[PDB]
Amino acid sequence: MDVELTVEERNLLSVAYKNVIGARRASWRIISSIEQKEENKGGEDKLKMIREYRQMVETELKLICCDILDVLDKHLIPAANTGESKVFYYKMKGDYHRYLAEFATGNDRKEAAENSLVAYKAASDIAMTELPPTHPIRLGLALNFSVFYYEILNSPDRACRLAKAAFDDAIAELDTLSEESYKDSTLIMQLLRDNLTLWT
Amino acid sequence: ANTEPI
């Protein structure tokens, strides 16, 4: 059955889970760099210890992500009324599938990327039709989606087009946004602008 | 590649 969350509860929980995840994701990147460095450089026991560690960390990540997605699909996005919340939960679905794809293998990688792209596209359709271009949930969607493109889908072309579009729609609407509303969004815009100038 | 901040 269903569950609805106030914006502030949503943010609390989302932050908490992202804390956990990001710890585990960065650890995974580091273990892999050590793994590749040793794997190129020989070594018996040490490579075994490192591979076993990387495996254990992948296990934890997949377990957490899969649980997150099962509550999203089972309880949250069915219950979503507002358009901001629909976009929110569909973007979360994209995020956790993308983190699945970040380390996933072969067909598991392929399934994860497909599910992520479905979810981001769903978020996008709602964000277009219900959320201002300066809305932070929309700017976050744009940023994470373009990153999805560039890193996972490896379409720099499409990532950059998405990022520029979102940036400029915002910049356009900006002269017409309040004070307490605009300081709530500058930082996502600058992140999209930074990613973009990076990608050239 | 910098995704949305916590």
Numbering used by the authors:
A (entry chain A): 33 to 232
B (entry chain B): 67 to 72
The authors write:
PEAK pseudokinases regulate cell migration, invasion and proliferation by recruiting key signaling proteins to the cytoskeleton. PEAK proteins are a unique group of pseudokinase (PsK) scaffolds that can self-assemble regulatory networks. In addition to the conserved PsK and SHED domains, all PEAK proteins have an N-terminal intrinsically disordered region (IDR) replete with short linear motifs (SLiMs)—conserved sequence motifs that can that form dynamically regulated docking sites to recruit interactors involved in PEAK signaling. Here, we elucidate the molecular details of key PEAK signaling interactions with the adapter proteins CrkII and Grb2 and the scaffold protein 14-3-3.
The second region we identified was a “tandem site” that comprises two directly adjacent motifs that were both conserved: a PRM known to bind CrkIINSH3 (consensus motif: PxLPxK); and a putative binding site for 14-3-3 proteins (mode 1 consensus motif: Rxx(pS/T)xP). This tandem site was found to be conserved not only in vertebrate orthologs of PEAK3, but also in vertebrate orthologs across the PEAK family. For each isoform, phosphodependent binding was observed and the PEAK3tandem-pS69 phosphopeptide consistently showed ~10-fold tighter affinity (KD ~ 0.16–0.78 µM) than those of PEAK1tandem-pT1165 or PEAK2tandem-pS826 (KD ~ 1–10 µM). We also solved two crystal structures of 14-3-3ε: PEAK1tandem-pT1165 and 14-3-3ε:PEAK2tandem-pS826 complexes, which were lower resolution (3.1 Å) but similarly confirmed phosphorecognition and a canonical mode of binding. In each of the three 14-3-3:tandem peptide structures, no clear electron density was observed for the adjacent CrkIINSH3 PRM likely due to flexibility and crystallographic averaging. Proteomic analysis of insect cell derived PEAK2IDR1 showed phosphorylation of the tandem site 14-3-3 motif (RAASSP), whereas phosphorylation at this motif was not observed for PEAK1IDR1 (RANTEP). PEAK3 appears to be unique from PEAK1/2 in its interaction with 14-3-3 at the tandem motif, displaying ~10-fold higher affinity for 14-3-3 (PEAK3 pS69), compared to either PEAK1 (pT1165) or PEAK2 (pS826). For PEAK3, the pS69 site is sufficient for stable 14-3-3 recruitment, whereas the longer IDRs of PEAK1/2 are predicted to harbor additional 14-3-3 motifs and different mechanisms may exist.
